[PDB]
Amino acid sequence: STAGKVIKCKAAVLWEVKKPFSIEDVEVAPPKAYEVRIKMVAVGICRTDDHVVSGNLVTPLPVILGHEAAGIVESVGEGVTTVKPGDKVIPLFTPQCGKCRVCKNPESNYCLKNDLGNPRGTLQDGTRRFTCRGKPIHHFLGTSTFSQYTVVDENAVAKIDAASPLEKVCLIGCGFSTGYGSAVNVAKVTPGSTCAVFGLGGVGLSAVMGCKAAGAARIIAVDINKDKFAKAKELGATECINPQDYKKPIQEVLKEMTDGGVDFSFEVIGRLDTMMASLLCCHEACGTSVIVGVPPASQNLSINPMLLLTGRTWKGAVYGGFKSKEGIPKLVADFMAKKFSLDALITHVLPFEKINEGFDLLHSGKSIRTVLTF
Amino acid sequence: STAGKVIKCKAAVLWEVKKPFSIEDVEVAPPKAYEVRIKMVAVGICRTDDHVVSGNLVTPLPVILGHEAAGIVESVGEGVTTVKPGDKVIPLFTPQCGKCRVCKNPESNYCLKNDLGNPRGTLQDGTRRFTCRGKPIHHFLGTSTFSQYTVVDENAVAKIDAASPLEKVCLIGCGFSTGYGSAVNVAKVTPGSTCAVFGLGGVGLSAVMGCKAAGAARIIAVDINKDKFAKAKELGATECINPQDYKKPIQEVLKEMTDGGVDFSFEVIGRLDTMMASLLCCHEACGTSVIVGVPPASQNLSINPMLLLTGRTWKGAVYGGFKSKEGIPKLVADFMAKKFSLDALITHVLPFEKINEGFDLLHSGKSIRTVLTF
Numbered sequence: 020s021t022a023g024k025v026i027k028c029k030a031a032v033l034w035e036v037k038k039p040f041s042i043e044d045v046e047v048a049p050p051k052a053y054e055v056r057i058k059m060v061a062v063g064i065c066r067t068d069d070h071v072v073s074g075n076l077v078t079p080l081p082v083i084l085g086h087e088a089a090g091i092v093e094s095v096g097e098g099v100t101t102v103k104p105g106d107k108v109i110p111l112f113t114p115q116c117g118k119c120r121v122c123k124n125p126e127s128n129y130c131l132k133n134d135l136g137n138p139r140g141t142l143q144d145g146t147r148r149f150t151c152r153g154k155p156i157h158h159f160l161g162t163s164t165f166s167q168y169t170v171v172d173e174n175a176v177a178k179i180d181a182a183s184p185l186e187k188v189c190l191i192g193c194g195f196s197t198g199y200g201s202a203v204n205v206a207k208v209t210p211g212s213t214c215a216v217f218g219l220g221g222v223g224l225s226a227v228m229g230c231k232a233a234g235a236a237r238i239i240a241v242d243i244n245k246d247k248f249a250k251a252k253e254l255g256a257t258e259c260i261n262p263q264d265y266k267k268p269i270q271e272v273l274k275e276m277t278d279g280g281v282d283f284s285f286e287v288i289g290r291l292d293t294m295m296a297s298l299l300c301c302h303e304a305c306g307t308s309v310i311v312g313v314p315p316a317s318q319n320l321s322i323n324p325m326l327l328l329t330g331r332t333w334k335g336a337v338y339g340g341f342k343s344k345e346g347i348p349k350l351v352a353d354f355m356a357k358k359f360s361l362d363a364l365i366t367h368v369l370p371f372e373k374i375n376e377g378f379d380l381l382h383s384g385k386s387i388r389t390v391l392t393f
Numbered sequence: 394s395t396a397g398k399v400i401k402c403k404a405a406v407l408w409e410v411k412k413p414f415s416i417e418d419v420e421v422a423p424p425k426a427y428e429v430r431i432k433m434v435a436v437g438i439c440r441t442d443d444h445v446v447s448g449n450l451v452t453p454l455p456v457i458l459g460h461e462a463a464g465i466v467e468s469v470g471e472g473v474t475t476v477k478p479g480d481k482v483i484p485l486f487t488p489q490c491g492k493c494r495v496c497k498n499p500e501s502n503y504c505l506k507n508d509l510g511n512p513r514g515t516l517q518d519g520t521r522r523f524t525c526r527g528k529p530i531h532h533f534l535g536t537s538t539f540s541q542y543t544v545v546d547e548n549a550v551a552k553i554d555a556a557s558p559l560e561k562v563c564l565i566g567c568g569f570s571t572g573y574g575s576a577v578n579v580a581k582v583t584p585g586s587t588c589a590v591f592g593l594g595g596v597g598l599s600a601v602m603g604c605k606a607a608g609a610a611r612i613i614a615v616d617i618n619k620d621k622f623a624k625a626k627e628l629g630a631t632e633c634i635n636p637q638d639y640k641k642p643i644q645e646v647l648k649e650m651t652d653g654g655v656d657f658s659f660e661v662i663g664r665l666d667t668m669m670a671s672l673l674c675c676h677e678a679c680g681t682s683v684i685v686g687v688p689p690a691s692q693n694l695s696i697n698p699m700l701l702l703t704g705r706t707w708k709g710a711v712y713g714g715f716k717s718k719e720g721i722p723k724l725v726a727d728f729m730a731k732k733f734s735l736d737a738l739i740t741h742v743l744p745f746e747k748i749n750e751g752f753d754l755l756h757s758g759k760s761i762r763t764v765l766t767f
C-alpha cells in the first residue's frame with residue numbers, strides 16, 4: 020500500500036542550470052487536503068522544460084521539471100472530489116480554481132493560482148512535497164511530471180476518458196492544446212484567411228493544425244530547419260519557407276507573398292527576433308499577431324507604436340486560451356472520437372531513464388515530441 | 394462664378410515647423426476627375442494638426458493643415474456622383490475607396506489610399522492643388538481644411554444630413570468619431586466592465602462617452618490637468634485621478650483600484666510613457682489596451698513580451714475603427730436624432746483668422762475643442 024505514506028521513487032532532478040538531468044531516488048510526501056498524488060505513465064518533452072535548463076526561464080532550483088503528461092491517481096487528500104484513485108488524469112501547468120476573477124471571466128484562463136509569473140516552485144499552499152538526498156526539491160509549474168510520482172493541486176488535475184492511451188494524450192496536457200488553441204481560441208482564425216506560423220515544434224505544428232481546422236485558405240510555415248517541412252505540409256501548411264534561404268528580412272518576404280501581410284501570424288519559438296518578424300508580417304490594417312513562444316528572461320522588444328495604430332492587434336496567451344480543467348477533457352474526448360490525431364507529432368519514444376537523450380533529440384532538431392514512458 | 398476656375402482665397406499656411414501659421418492668399422486649382430472642391434464652414438483644432446507644428450508628426454512642408462471639418466460643396470470633378478454642389482459634407486482624414494483589401498475587410502478601416510504612413514502631402518493622384526506666392530503647397534491627410542476652399546478626393550468626402558449644424562458636427566469628422574469608436578468598435582467595451590482613459594482632450598473625452606455608451610460600470614479618467622475632471626465626470630467618468638498626486642507609478646495605482654487592472658485601457662495623448670502605463674494598467678489575464686494617441690516620430694517603446702503572453706490584447710486604430718465614408722454620416726444622423734450632444738466638447742469658438750489664438754488655447758490646456766468659423 021502507498022496511500023498515506025511517503026513514496027520513495029525515481030525522478031529527474033535538475034540541480035544546476037546548464038547541466039544534464041540526474042535520475043535520483045526521491046521522497047514524495049502524501050497529498051495534503053485538496054491535493055492529488057499521481058503515478059506518471061507518460062510525459063512529453065516540451066521546450067518550456069528546456070528553457071529552465073538553458074537559463075531562459077527562471078524558476079527556483081533544485082527542481083523537478085516536467086508538465087506535459089498523463090498518469091493514474093494513486094491517492095487523494097482530504098476534501099478531493101473531482102478525481103479518485105485509479106482515474107486517468109492529465110496535470111495542468113495553469114490551474115483552473117474556478118473562483119478567481121480570471122476563472123469567472125469567460126474569455127480568460129490565466130488563473131490566479133498559477134506559478135508562472137514570479138515562480139515559487141511550490142504547490143498552492145506554498146510548500147514542497149519532494150525531498151532528495153536530504154534536500155527539499157522545488158516543483159515546476161505546479162506539476163513536476165519528470166517523476167514516477169508527483170503531487171498536484173486538485174484544481175490543476177483533469178480527469179479524462181478511462182480508455183485514453185496515455186502515451187498519446189499526454190500531448191494534450193500542453194503542446195497540442197496550446198498550439199491548436201492559439202489558432203482557434205486566441206487568434207480566432209477565420210475561414211478563408213491567410214496565416215503564418217513561426218516555429219514547427221510540437222506546439223507550432225499544433226498551431227498549423229488549428230489554422231487548418233479553422234478553415235484558413237493559406238498557412239505559411241516558417242522554420243530554419245527544413246526537415247520539419249514535410250510534417251508541416253502533412254498537417255495543413257500550404258507553403259513552407261526557410262528564412263535562411265533569403266537575402267531580405269522574412270517579414271518583407273511574407274508580406275510580398277500575401278498582398279501586404281497575413282491576417283494572422285503566430286510566433287511559436289520564443290525569440291525576440293521572430294516575435295518582431297511575426298508582428299511585422301501581419302497586415303498593418305487588419306492583421307492579428309499572437310505570441311505563443313516563451314521569451315528569454317526579462318528581455319524586451321523595441322516597437323514603434325505606429326505598428327499598432329494602423330489597425331494591428333497584438334496578443335498573447337498561455338495554454339491556447341483554454342480554461343484548463345474544463346478544456347483538456349473535451350480535447351481528449353475529441354481525440355478518442357478521432358477528430359484529430361497526434362501520431363505525426365510523436366516522433367520518438369524512450370524510457371524515462373533516457374530523459375537526457377530525449378533532450379539531446381530536442382536540441383538536434385530531429386524530434387518534434389519525444390514521449391517518455393515510466 | 395468659380396466652377397472650373399482657379400480660386401484665390403485665404404488659407405493658413407505652415408512654412409516651417411515651430412512657427413505660427415501664416416494667413417495668406419493662396420490659389421486652389423479646380424477639382425480633377427473624382428475630386429471635390431469644398432467651401433469650408435467650420436474646422437476643429439485637433440492635436441494631430443499641432444503635432445506637425447511641433448515636429449512630432451512628419452509631413453512635407455510647406456503645408457495647409459486641418460482635417461476635422463465641415464463645409465459645402467462648391468464644385469465637383471468629372472465622374473463624381475456621391476456629392477453635388479450645395480451638399481453639406483465632412484472631409485475624411487482616412488479615405489474609404491471601397492475597393493482595396495482593407496476596405497473590403499469588414500474589420501478594418503485603414504484604406505490603402507491613405508496619406509498617413511509615409512505622407513506625400515498630395516491628393517491620391519500624387520499631385521497638389523494649392524499654390525501660394527508662386528510655389529506649390531502640400532496637402533495634409535488628403536484634406537487640408539485650414540483654408541476657405543479645399544479640394545479632396547471623392548472617397549474622402551462624406552455627404553451628410555442637409556440640416557446639420559456645421560459648427561458642431563465638424564467634430565464628428567475626427568475627434569468624436571475616433572474617441573467614441575475607439576471604445577465601441579476597437580476595444581469593444583462590454584457592459585459592466587472597468588475602463589481607464591488616459592488623456593481628456595476632445596478625443597479622450599469622446600472615448601469616455603464611448604465607454605459610457607457601451608455600458609462600462611467604471612470609467613477612470615486620467616489626466617495631469619485636473620481642470621478637465623468636471624467635463625470627464627459630466628460625460629461618464631466614475632473616478633478622476635491625476636498621476637501627479639501619487640508617489641506610486643500610475644499603472645500600480647490603477648491596478649490597486651481595480652482588482653488587478655482594468656478590462657479596457659485607452660491611451661489618448663500620444664506619449665510613450667502613457668502608452669506603457671496604459672498597457673500595464675489593464676489586467677494581465679483579461680485586459681485589452683487600445684492606442685489612440687499619435688506617438689512622436691521614430692520613437693519606440695520597450696516591452697517585455699510576457700506582458701502579452703499572460704493574456705493581454707494590445708491594439709491600435711485610426712478613426713475609432715469606423716469605415717470613414719459610411720460611418721461619418723451615420724454618426725451625424727445619430728447626432729441629429731439627439732442620441733448624443735457635442736456641446737460639452739466645444740469650449741471655444743473663433744473666426745478662422747484667429748487660428749493662432751486657437752492653437753494658443755490648445756497649448757494652454759484651457760480648451761477641449763476650439764472650432765474656427767469661416
Ligand SMILES: NC(=O)c1ccc[n+]([C@@H]2O[C@H](COP(=O)([O-])OP(=O)(O)OC[C@H]3O[C@@H](n4cnc5c(N)ncnc54)[C@H](O)[C@@H]3O)[C@@H](O)[C@H]2O)c1
Pocket residue numbers: 064065066067070193194197217218219220221222223241242243244247262287288289290293310311312313314336337338339384387702
Ligand atoms: N504559451 C504557452 O502556453 C506555451 C505552451 C507551451 C510551450 N510554449 C513555448 O512555445 C515555444 C515552442 O515550444 P516547442 O516545444 O514547440 O519548441 P521546439 O523547440 O520543439 O520548436 C521550435 C521550432 O522553432 C524553430 N526555430 C528555432 N529558432 C528559429 C529561428 N530563429 N527562426 C525560425 N525557426 C526557428 C525550431 O527549428 C523548431 O522547429 C517554446 O518557447 C515554448 O516555451 C508556450
Ligand SMILES: NC(=O)c1ccc[n+]([C@@H]2O[C@H](COP(=O)([O-])OP(=O)(O)OC[C@H]3O[C@@H](n4cnc5c(N)ncnc54)[C@H](O)[C@@H]3O)[C@@H](O)[C@H]2O)c1
Pocket residue numbers: 328438439440441442444567568571591592593594595596597615616617618621636661662663664667684685686687688710711712713758761
Ligand atoms: N488614432 C486617431 O485616429 C487619432 C485621431 C485623432 C487624434 N489622435 C491623437 O489623439 C491624441 C489626443 O488628441 P486630442 O486632440 O484629444 O489632444 P489634447 O491635447 O486636446 O488632449 C490631450 C490630453 O492629455 C493630457 N495629457 C498630456 N500629457 C499627459 C501626461 N503626460 N499624462 C497624463 N495626461 C496628459 C492633456 O492634459 C490633455 O487633456 C493626440 O496624440 C492626437 O494626435 C489620433
Ligand SMILES: O=CNCc1ccccc1
Pocket residue numbers: 065067068076086112135136193313337702
Ligand atoms: O509549456 C508550458 N508553459 C508555458 C509557460 C511557462 C511559464 C510561463 C508562461 C508560459
Ligand SMILES: O=CNCc1ccccc1
Pocket residue numbers: 328439441442450460486509510567687711
Ligand atoms: O487626427 C487625425 N489623424 C490621426 C493620425 C494622423 C496621422 C497618422 C496616424 C493618425
Ligand SMILES: [Zn+2]
Pocket residue numbers: 065066067068086087193194
Ligand atoms: Zn509545455
Ligand SMILES: [Zn+2]
Pocket residue numbers: 114115116117118119120121122130131132
Ligand atoms: Zn482561478
Ligand SMILES: [Zn+2]
Pocket residue numbers: 488489490491492493494495496504505506
Ligand atoms: Zn480602400
Ligand SMILES: [Zn+2]
Pocket residue numbers: 439440441442460461567568
Ligand atoms: Zn484629428
